[PDB]
Design a protein around this ligand. Structure first.
Ligand SMILES: OCCn1cc(Br)cn1
Ligand SMILES: OCCn1cc(Br)cn1
Ligand SMILES: [Cl-]
Length: 130
């Protein structure tokens, strides 16, 4: 229905604003663009499902997220990819892990404070109806 399309549009506007807020944070700059294979030719080898905030915007705009849970799965990938690719005790790896945990925690904290639980529940029910 048109009302269901309006609901999904509101979801995309919300997710684009959350993603923009993460992308303008200087801590998260490394997560804004895909990994350049020139710099890291082993990246695409080790990390099966690369994810970054530019890819998330592209997915919102392709109507790939029908619930906030589906969006948080891609935020969780950004975090888990960084924990897996940079697991060493050296400061460069620890800094990337801490920034990735902080992205993830920030996204969840914005959604806890600003997502209406009944809005998420409605999206879930439309999705499950398709
Ligand atoms: O540092 C542990 C927190 N964490 C986030 C993901 Br995604 C998996 N674990
Ligand atoms: O392991 C993810 C969380 N973390 C904290 C520091 Br400090 C570095 N990583
Ligand atoms: Cl830096």
């Amino acid at each position: 229905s048109m009302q269901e399309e309006d609901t999904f549009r509101e979801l995309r506007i919300f997710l684009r604003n959350v993603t923009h807020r993460l992308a303008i944070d200087k801590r998260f700059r490394v997560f804004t663009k895909p990994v350049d294979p020139d710099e890291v030719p082993d990246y695409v080898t080790v990390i099966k499902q690369p994810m970054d905030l530019s890819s998330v915007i592209s997915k919102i705009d392709l109507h790939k997220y029908l619930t906030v849970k589906d969006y948080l799965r891609d935020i969780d990938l950004i975090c888990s990819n960084a924990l897996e690719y940079n697991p060493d005790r050296d400061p460069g790896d620890r800094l990337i892990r801490h920034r990735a945990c902080a992205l993830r925690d920030t996204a969840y904290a914005i959604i806890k404070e600003e997502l209406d639980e009944d809005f998420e529940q409605l999206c879930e029910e439309i999705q499950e109806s398709r």
